[PDB]
Amino acid sequence: SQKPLSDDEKFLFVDKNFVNNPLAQADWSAKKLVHGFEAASIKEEKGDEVTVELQENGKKVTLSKDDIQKMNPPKFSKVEDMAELTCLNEASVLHNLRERYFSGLIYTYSGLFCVVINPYKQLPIYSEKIIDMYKGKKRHEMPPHIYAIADTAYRSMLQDREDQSILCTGESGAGKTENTKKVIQYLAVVASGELEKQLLQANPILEAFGNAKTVKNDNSSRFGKFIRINFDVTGYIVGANIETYLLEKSRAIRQAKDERTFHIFYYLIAGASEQMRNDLLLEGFNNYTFLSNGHVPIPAQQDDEMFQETLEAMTIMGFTEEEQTSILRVVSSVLQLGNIVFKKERNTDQASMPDNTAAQKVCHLMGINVTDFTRSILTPRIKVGRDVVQKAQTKEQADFAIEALAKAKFERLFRWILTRVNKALDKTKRQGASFLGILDIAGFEIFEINSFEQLCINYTNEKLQQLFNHTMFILEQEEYQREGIEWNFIDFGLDLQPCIELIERPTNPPGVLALLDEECWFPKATDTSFVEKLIQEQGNHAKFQKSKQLKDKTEFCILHYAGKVTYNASAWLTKNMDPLNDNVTSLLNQSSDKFVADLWKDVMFRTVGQLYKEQLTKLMTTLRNTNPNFVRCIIPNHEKRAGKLDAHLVLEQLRCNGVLEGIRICRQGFPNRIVFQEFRQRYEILAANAIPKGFMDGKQACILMIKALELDPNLYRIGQSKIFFRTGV
Amino acid sequence: DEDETTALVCDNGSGLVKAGFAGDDAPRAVFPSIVGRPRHQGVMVGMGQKDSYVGDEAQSKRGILTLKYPIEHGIITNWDDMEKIWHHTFYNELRVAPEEHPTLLTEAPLNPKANREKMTQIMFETFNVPAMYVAIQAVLSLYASGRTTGIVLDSGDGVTHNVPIYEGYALPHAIMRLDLAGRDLTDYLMKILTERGYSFVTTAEREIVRDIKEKLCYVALDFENEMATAASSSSLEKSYELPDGQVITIGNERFRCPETLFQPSFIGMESAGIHETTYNSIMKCDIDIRKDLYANNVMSGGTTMYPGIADRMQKEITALAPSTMKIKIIAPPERKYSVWIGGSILASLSTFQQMWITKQEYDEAGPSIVHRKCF
Ligand SMILES: Nc1ncnc2c1ncn2[C@@H]1O[C@H](COP(=O)(O)OP(=O)(O)O)[C@@H](O)[C@H]1O
Ligand SMILES: [Mg+2]
């Protein structure tokens, strides 16, 4: 794993600066040496306005401290793990990342993170030889790589008897499926199938039903998933089972400017044959309420082919031609549900349907009685016990019930397919003693202004990053326990805890999402009144940022993990809904189309936020029962220019990946931890005096040198094999 | 559950008792605040193996039981049988632990302190509850209607009230306590059924008359002309088949009793009618306030479940209201359990935690904690 001459190590081994010299004067400029940054020397401080000489270009320029950090010694050029820097300044982290990616070093360590930057080309550095190079190797011994992480995980399962999980997250497309595959392939060789070919075909199917287009990514999964790889008690792969959480169901019924709903809706209308369109009651893109918005097409793409492609995959997956069609009957009927609109009655309408042809279209495809359908929607009946109470709803609620159904149907359909994937994937006979839960999920999502969907996403993300902060803390304290380090500090997950409660918190002063729940219960609640509730309750929310005197008429901000984010909330009461009527559910069970009957072969409202809280909890709990391994996905260049890295795009993602914040946690500990004998070697030229680079009393000798150095006791701590040192020390 | 609260809802009354819980959509069980006792007791040919029957039990065995009314107005007559009612509510129907889930009791506007003492003491001594909130009957209906302001009229069999809600809250004089409810229309119905040729001597038969009212009582718009019209003893005359073997036929009398509600002179009294006493309570507010009160005139209760009441009340309100003001009666789709619904709503809201009274607070301040929390 250490030979550049070989292509399997060419884009792996860190060929860098090997000056090998402990004297700070020899390996660092005598002057105050300072989203790429220019080499500069600090000349004069006028407050934040610090004038520096931009040595890079020879330009004496006044520059705010905002862009001024101490540049680390040249000897740290492209180190394997960013945590190896003397002073953890992200200016040099970014430069190492730029240099490393440019040099072919796609894999980078950063504390606990296995950073993967997309090369936009195939790199040989994942061969079976390379597998063997990491097989049984202790992480740091070899260059950064998922294989090392996979090795760790494997032997943690095998030797330590601990269930593992891969928290792989960031930007979709940046080695999304690759990174997953890297883990699987590592162990395909070590922990040693055919049924995953079907899983590979399932991927694009589930993308049709799970991915959508947005502003910053045109193939983003609108859900989180993980792959449970099952292992034999003796450490062998015997099977796999996948599961999804937090499907952005609202995506099936709405799309914003520059967005597309779930791809399948377009694949079907565009790619269906005329015979299919007739049989499926398909109309054009302007014939639906759903999919309303001019952003239907994608430049240089073709839905026709992708449609067909999906069907080809489905064939491979074992979907019967009729099942395939039935699935598309559902898809179509969802769009036809969009076309259902209620009577304009001036009570909260029981509603009215002068012409329910759209519903007839839906019930044609479903094979259900449109008049039972309509009637029960007009006045939903809720079984209490022996009695059933016809709970009449308004026409607005009836409209929402249709959208609720639409969303529910899409999800059911999705889950059905998902189940079928597992029917193909998850082999029956198998030991499944342990497992590796490979988590595949997007990182923080930030636009110029976010909405509900993003709130839930970022809420999700902070829950998951809490797993990181918590875990990281433990791991740091584990070393403190191994050593004699008493700096307990604080459980860093508590940084997210109030940010999480800000959303999650129910009774007691409600959080933001809980207020949305409140507001979606009172009949005449508005989105303005929601904002007013935020204004009232935010005095108790330290992590909530009330906006400006004029701005607080609608928008407000939240102090998120990935940076402060402005949220809109102009229509959140129309989002946090879902009046799903189970009279329809029953009718669907009673469908003539038996596919549909199977979808709902067995059998309220709540809120969308609440549903995500539940699903999140299930995911988080499952992940917390394992040992988090950390992998992050970065897009260095949106033009896909292999070899180009824009630190702008990257730093943004470092923050959204928790890497930049991970650095802050490291800044709060002891990054530079030096081995007692090492310390004598590192600081001999730096004022040895009585103690050279070797001395009898292991611990005191180093301490004597520390006294000579005159270091501050609050910046270090004497361990058992190391002396812990803070960043910059 | 266990560690978490989740409140319970109990909307009692001499009419119907609605059992449920916070966030519930519809009452789990409904039965009158009535407790029956066998005339013979002990060993009987036809009994339910009890010497004390509650709610549906009492109404199922009317033929053998003497019917007592622990709630009479909403006034507690027998607080021991009130425990039986709440036993039936929480233990039998709901089947939940009161030493765990906070509870919510409803209260008729202008309720004597003695009743508050009886209710509070029991809940924190017999059914020991972590916290219990007493909520104003009528006001709960307002919330169920989906409003935070307006006239709040609640008119059933027990007692008719009106609690106008505005910037501030109605005081003991703008709150109506009308002694002219369905109880009086029930007894009047009985009397005019004897005019036809029927007899309802016993308490069980008194209840049968009330049960008859439920499914026939029609609210006329033009009594005189409809009285003549409904003389059709064939096409418009309709009987009530009591599931037991008794059929009571009623003609144009179906809309004779409602007239007593609007005009007690139909009984023989000079008392003001429901819309006149309502008007009287409306005049206790400012001109600006009563305009908004008219705009959202929320009505619920048994007397608002009868056909024709929507148009009749609207006419009557506009008769006693400025023509320059917006006048609209609010008629929810569910006006029978509108009070219970309000309880379910507020109990599910976090604001319940700032309204309830805890057992600790009771134990310290005693019964007086009720008014110490709020009057
Ligand atoms: N189907 C019905 N039609 C008309 N009135 C009904 C019907 N069912 C029930 N009611 C009446 O509605 C009223 C129930 O209102 P409620 O507020 O629970 O009563 P109360 O407060 O008098 O205990 C009773 O007077 C009952 O007779
Ligand atoms: Mg009522």
Side-chain angles (χ1 to χ4, degrees), chain A residues 2-729, chain B:
Chain A
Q2 298 182 333
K3 183 178 179 179
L5 293 174
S6 169
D7 288 344
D8 291 354
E9 291 85 356
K10 184 172 178 179
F11 306 105
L12 184 60
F13 182 74
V14 182
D15 184 351
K16 67 182 276 291
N17 184 315
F18 300 109
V19 70
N20 296 320
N21 185 330
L23 180 63
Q25 292 176 337
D27 65 13
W28 191 72
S29 175
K31 303 298 184 182
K32 294 180 180 179
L33 183 65
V34 177
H35 291 170
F37 296 85
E38 295 186 15
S41 175
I42 296 171
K43 297 297 184 180
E44 184 175 358
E45 179 179 359
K46 296 182 182 295
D48 289 346
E49 295 182 359
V50 177
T51 298
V52 301
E53 181 183 0
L54 299 175
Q55 290 177 329
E56 193 74 31
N57 293 292
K59 296 181 180 181
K60 186 176 179 181
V61 176
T62 300
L63 179 64
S64 174
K65 287 181 178 178
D66 288 343
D67 294 323
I68 299 174
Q69 294 186 310
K70 183 179 180 181
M71 183 62 67
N72 283 297
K75 70 184 183 185
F76 293 112
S77 176
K78 299 189 277 178
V79 295
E80 289 178 351
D81 187 332
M82 294 300 99
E84 294 176 287
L85 295 173
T86 296
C87 184
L88 300 176
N89 291 323
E90 71 271 21
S92 66
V93 171
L94 288 172
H95 288 177
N96 284 331
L97 291 172
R98 182 179 65 200
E99 288 178 355
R100 285 177 67 81
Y101 178 73
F102 182 78
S103 297
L105 305 175
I106 270 51
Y107 293 93
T108 300
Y109 281 156
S110 183
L112 298 177
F113 296 109
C114 182
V115 176
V116 181
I117 301 171
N118 189 342
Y120 306 113
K121 62 184 179 181
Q122 184 179 11
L123 302 179
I125 65 173
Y126 67 87
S127 72
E128 291 179 353
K129 180 179 178 180
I130 295 300
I131 291 170
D132 287 345
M133 294 300 100
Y134 289 108
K135 185 179 179 182
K137 274 71 176 182
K138 295 179 181 179
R139 183 181 184 270
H140 68 280
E141 290 177 337
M142 299 291 174
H145 202 296
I146 289 170
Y147 284 6
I149 298 301
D151 188 76
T152 299
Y154 175 69
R155 287 187 288 107
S156 295
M157 289 187 283
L158 178 61
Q159 294 175 330
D160 293 332
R161 315 309 298 181
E162 185 179 66
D163 292 341
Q164 302 295 305
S165 62
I166 307 299
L167 302 185
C168 180
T169 184
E171 192 71 39
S172 177
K176 178 181 172 72
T177 61
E178 181 178 357
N179 288 346
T180 297
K181 184 176 179 180
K182 292 285 169 60
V183 173
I184 293 168
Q185 186 65 47
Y186 181 76
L187 295 179
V189 173
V190 172
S192 67
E194 184 69 19
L195 298 176
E196 291 181 353
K197 291 178 182 176
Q198 287 177 305
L199 182 60
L200 290 172
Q201 294 300 312
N203 280 336
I205 293 168
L206 294 175
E207 291 189 20
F209 293 91
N211 291 20
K213 179 174 186 294
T214 189
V215 173
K216 290 185 172 179
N217 196 304
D218 63 359
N219 194 18
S220 175
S221 294
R222 299 283 95 193
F223 65 97
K225 68 177 185 179
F226 76 98
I227 302 173
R228 184 175 178 173
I229 299 171
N230 293 305
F231 290 81
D232 188 274
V233 68
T234 58
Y236 295 89
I237 297 170
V238 296
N241 187 296
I242 66 171
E243 184 60 277
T244 64
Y245 299 90
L246 306 175
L247 182 66
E248 187 180 305
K249 288 165 69 172
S250 69
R251 179 54 55 181
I253 63 169
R254 296 291 185 276
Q255 64 177 79
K257 181 184 180 293
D258 305 334
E259 305 190 322
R260 302 185 92 201
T261 66
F262 290 109
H263 284 199
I264 192 65
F265 289 116
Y266 305 88
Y267 287 175
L268 178 56
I269 292 169
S273 70
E274 292 298 318
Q275 182 64 48
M276 290 178 183
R277 290 195 183 103
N278 287 339
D279 289 344
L280 299 176
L281 303 181
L282 294 172
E283 303 181 49
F285 285 109
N286 292 322
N287 293 127
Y288 295 103
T289 301
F290 289 165
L291 309 182
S292 175
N293 186 299
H295 195 80
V296 174
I298 301 174
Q301 299 296 308
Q302 184 175 6
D303 288 342
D304 294 341
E305 294 297 313
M306 290 187 278
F307 174 66
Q308 185 65 43
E309 182 179 0
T310 299
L311 292 175
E312 292 297 319
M314 290 172 76
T315 298
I316 292 168
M317 289 304 297
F319 286 93
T320 301
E321 182 178 359
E322 182 62 28
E323 288 180 321
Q324 291 183 33
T325 299
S326 296
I327 289 167
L328 295 177
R329 284 196 288 269
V330 173
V331 171
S332 180
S333 69
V334 168
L335 293 174
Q336 290 299 2
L337 287 171
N339 286 336
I340 299 172
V341 178
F342 265 86
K343 300 311 195 178
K344 208 139 180 171
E345 210 64 49
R346 337 156 277 155
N347 44 18
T348 249
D349 198 358
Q350 40 271 59
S352 179
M353 294 297 290
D355 183 345
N356 66 351
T357 298
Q360 292 179 35
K361 289 176 178 173
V362 171
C363 293
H364 179 74
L365 293 173
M366 294 299 97
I368 61 175
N369 184 343
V370 71
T371 62
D372 289 335
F373 178 80
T374 299
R375 185 178 67 255
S376 67
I377 293 167
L378 291 171
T379 58
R381 302 174 303 180
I382 300 173
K383 183 177 180 180
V384 177
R386 290 178 180 174
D387 293 338
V388 179
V389 179
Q390 186 176 13
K391 185 180 181 185
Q393 68 180 340
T394 66
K395 84 89 178 175
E396 291 178 352
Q397 291 175 312
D399 285 334
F400 281 123
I402 292 297
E403 292 180 347
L405 179 62
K407 289 186 291 184
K409 285 172 63 175
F410 184 85
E411 182 182 8
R412 181 64 68 190
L413 185 64
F414 181 85
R415 295 287 183 183
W416 180 267
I417 292 167
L418 182 64
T419 299
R420 181 61 64 87
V421 172
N422 281 332
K423 288 182 179 295
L425 179 62
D426 187 349
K427 181 178 179 179
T428 62
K429 184 177 180 180
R430 61 171 174 78
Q431 182 62 51
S434 185
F435 65 90
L436 180 61
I438 300 171
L439 181 68
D440 182 356
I441 191 165
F444 281 80
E445 181 166 291
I446 301 173
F447 300 107
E448 62 275 18
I449 189 165
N450 284 8
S451 189
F452 173 77
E453 291 83 352
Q454 283 79 39
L455 181 62
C456 290
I457 290 167
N458 291 333
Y459 166 62
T460 294
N461 287 320
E462 288 180 345
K463 182 73 71 170
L464 296 177
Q465 295 307 321
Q466 186 175 44
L467 292 173
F468 164 68
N469 287 349
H470 180 67
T471 298
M472 183 177 186
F473 177 71
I474 291 168
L475 290 173
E476 182 63 9
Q477 289 298 316
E478 182 179 336
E479 291 295 319
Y480 292 9
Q481 290 174 335
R482 289 177 186 275
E483 298 286 309
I485 309 301
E486 295 176 298
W487 290 82
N488 288 336
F489 292 124
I490 189 167
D491 183 345
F492 291 107
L494 292 174
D495 288 354
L496 287 176
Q497 185 65 33
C499 292
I500 292 168
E501 289 176 7
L502 176 58
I503 305 303
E504 181 173 325
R505 186 183 294 167
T507 64
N508 306 328
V512 173
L513 186 55
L515 288 172
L516 187 58
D517 289 338
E518 177 178 329
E519 291 290 302
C520 293
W521 295 334
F522 183 69
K524 297 296 183 181
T526 64
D527 292 286
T528 298
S529 59
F530 169 66
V531 172
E532 290 175 348
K533 292 284 175 66
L534 293 172
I535 292 168
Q536 291 177 335
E537 292 296 1
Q538 59 84 30
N540 293 305
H541 292 295
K543 300 299 184 183
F544 184 95
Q545 177 66 66
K546 181 180 176 292
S547 65
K548 183 176 180 179
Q549 181 179 9
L550 299 177
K551 290 181 180 180
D552 68 10
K553 292 180 179 181
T554 298
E555 67 182 0
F556 63 88
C557 301
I558 296 173
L559 301 176
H560 283 297
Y561 182 70
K564 182 177 69 177
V565 178
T566 300
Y567 287 89
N568 182 251
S570 67
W572 284 4
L573 270 70
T574 64
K575 291 182 175 294
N576 193 36
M577 293 298 293
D578 203 36
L580 184 64
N581 185 355
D582 286 331
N583 287 263
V584 174
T585 299
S586 180
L587 182 58
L588 291 170
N589 183 29
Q590 297 178 60
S591 173
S592 294
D593 184 339
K594 300 307 179 188
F595 182 78
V596 172
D598 287 345
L599 287 174
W600 291 273
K601 68 182 181 181
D602 206 344
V603 299
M604 182 179 287
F605 173 52
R606 298 171 70 181
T607 68
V608 173
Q610 186 181 72
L611 290 170
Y612 286 156
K613 290 182 190 183
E614 179 179 335
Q615 291 177 35
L616 175 58
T617 299
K618 290 176 180 176
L619 175 60
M620 179 277 291
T621 299
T622 299
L623 293 173
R624 184 62 182 78
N625 289 334
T626 66
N627 186 338
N629 295 278
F630 307 99
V631 179
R632 297 293 186 272
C633 301
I634 296 175
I635 296 299
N637 180 251
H638 68 290
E639 299 167 290
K640 301 184 182 178
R641 294 180 185 274
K644 182 177 177 180
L645 184 150
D646 185 351
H648 179 82
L649 293 174
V650 172
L651 184 60
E652 179 180 340
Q653 292 171 71
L654 290 175
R655 181 60 182 269
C656 293
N657 289 339
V659 175
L660 183 60
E661 288 293 312
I663 292 168
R664 179 176 66 80
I665 292 169
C666 290
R667 288 176 179 166
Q668 296 297 309
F670 303 114
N672 292 336
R673 65 193 72 184
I674 301 296
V675 174
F676 283 101
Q677 178 58 33
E678 180 179 17
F679 184 86
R680 286 191 283 273
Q681 292 175 335
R682 296 289 187 189
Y683 292 85
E684 182 183 61
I685 193 65
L686 298 175
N689 297 331
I691 305 300
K693 67 182 180 181
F695 196 85
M696 178 186 70
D697 183 335
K699 292 181 180 177
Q700 187 64 49
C702 291
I703 292 168
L704 290 172
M705 291 176 73
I706 290 170
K707 288 181 178 182
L709 293 173
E710 299 185 350
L711 302 177
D712 183 340
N714 293 283
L715 298 178
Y716 70 85
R717 184 67 167 84
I718 303 298
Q720 296 300 330
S721 67
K722 295 181 181 178
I723 302 171
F724 283 63
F725 292 101
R726 191 171 187 189
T727 176
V729 180
Chain B
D1 291 339
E2 292 178 353
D3 291 342
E4 295 180 352
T5 59
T6 298
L8 304 172
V9 179
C10 180
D11 181 10
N12 66 28
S14 68
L16 297 172
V17 180
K18 283 73 60 177
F21 62 94
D24 193 352
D25 291 296
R28 182 174 175 81
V30 179
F31 58 91
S33 297
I34 299 174
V35 177
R37 183 174 179 181
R39 290 191 296 274
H40 184 74
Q41 300 175 76
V43 179
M44 299 178 69
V45 173
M47 65 180 295
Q49 304 299 301
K50 297 182 179 183
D51 290 328
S52 179
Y53 301 75
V54 180
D56 287 346
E57 291 177 332
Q59 301 306 299
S60 68
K61 299 296 182 184
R62 287 177 179 168
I64 63 170
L65 303 180
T66 298
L67 302 178
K68 302 296 185 181
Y69 298 89
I71 299 174
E72 181 179 358
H73 300 291
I75 298 169
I76 297 170
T77 67
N78 186 327
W79 64 273
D80 286 339
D81 288 345
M82 286 296 297
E83 289 179 349
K84 291 179 180 179
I85 291 168
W86 282 338
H87 182 82
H88 185 183
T89 298
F90 290 112
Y91 185 80
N92 286 336
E93 295 301 341
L94 289 170
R95 300 185 181 179
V96 297
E99 296 180 351
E100 181 177 357
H101 297 280
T103 63
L104 185 156
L105 300 179
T106 63
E107 177 181 69
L110 303 176
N111 183 39
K113 183 180 181 183
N115 289 329
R116 288 177 165 175
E117 290 178 352
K118 289 176 183 177
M119 290 188 289
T120 300
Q121 181 182 0
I122 291 168
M123 293 304 287
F124 295 114
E125 293 185 7
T126 296
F127 296 101
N128 295 306
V129 179
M132 182 275 281
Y133 175 52
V134 178
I136 300 170
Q137 184 181 321
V139 171
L140 295 174
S141 183
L142 177 65
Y143 284 109
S145 70
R147 295 291 186 278
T148 59
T149 186
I151 296 169
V152 185
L153 182 149
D154 193 22
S155 178
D157 290 343
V159 60
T160 297
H161 290 277
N162 187 39
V163 183
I165 301 299
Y166 54 105
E167 182 179 0
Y169 295 90
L171 302 177
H173 67 73
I175 298 170
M176 185 179 77
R177 183 164 69 196
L178 176 64
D179 188 18
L180 185 64
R183 180 202 67 200
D184 291 348
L185 273 62
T186 298
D187 288 343
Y188 190 77
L189 177 60
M190 177 185 69
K191 289 178 181 180
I192 67 174
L193 287 173
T194 296
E195 289 182 6
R196 290 182 66 89
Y198 296 107
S199 178
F200 301 90
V201 174
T202 64
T203 299
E205 288 169 305
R206 189 181 188 196
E207 287 296 329
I208 290 171
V209 172
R210 194 163 69 89
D211 288 343
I212 292 166
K213 183 169 77 79
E214 182 182 358
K215 297 295 186 179
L216 291 178
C217 180
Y218 160 74
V219 180
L221 299 178
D222 181 339
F223 176 78
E224 181 178 359
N225 284 320
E226 292 184 69
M227 178 182 67
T229 299
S232 176
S233 174
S234 178
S235 66
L236 298 177
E237 183 171 65
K238 183 175 180 179
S239 66
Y240 179 89
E241 182 180 358
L242 182 68
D244 188 356
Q246 183 176 38
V247 179
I248 306 300
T249 300
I250 302 178
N252 62 10
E253 295 89 12
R254 287 180 62 195
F255 49 92
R256 179 175 162 178
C257 291
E259 292 305 323
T260 67
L261 182 60
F262 291 103
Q263 293 183 33
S265 68
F266 277 86
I267 295 169
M269 297 183 286
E270 296 180 357
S271 176
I274 190 170
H275 64 292
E276 293 175 324
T277 58
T278 298
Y279 181 55
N280 286 342
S281 66
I282 292 167
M283 289 190 288
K284 299 296 184 183
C285 297
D286 291 346
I287 292 168
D288 289 345
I289 293 169
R290 70 179 67 181
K291 181 176 179 181
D292 288 345
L293 290 178
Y294 279 126
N296 295 282
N297 185 338
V298 176
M299 295 184 180
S300 72
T303 60
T304 64
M305 292 295 291
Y306 298 121
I309 194 65
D311 290 344
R312 179 62 182 269
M313 291 300 292
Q314 184 72 28
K315 181 178 178 180
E316 294 295 349
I317 293 299
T318 57
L320 298 174
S323 68
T324 62
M325 294 180 179
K326 182 177 180 178
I327 303 165
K328 182 177 179 179
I329 295 172
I330 306 302
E334 175 53 73
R335 297 188 298 281
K336 181 176 176 176
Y337 305 125
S338 70
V339 173
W340 175 93
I341 291 168
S344 180
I345 293 167
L346 293 178
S348 69
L349 295 177
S350 69
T351 61
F352 189 72
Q353 290 174 324
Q354 300 298 310
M355 291 190 291
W356 67 10
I357 299 171
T358 63
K359 182 176 180 294
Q360 184 68 36
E361 287 171 299
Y362 172 81
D363 287 343
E364 291 177 5
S368 72
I369 193 63
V370 172
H371 287 175
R372 290 178 187 275
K373 185 64 65 176
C374 186
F375 289 81

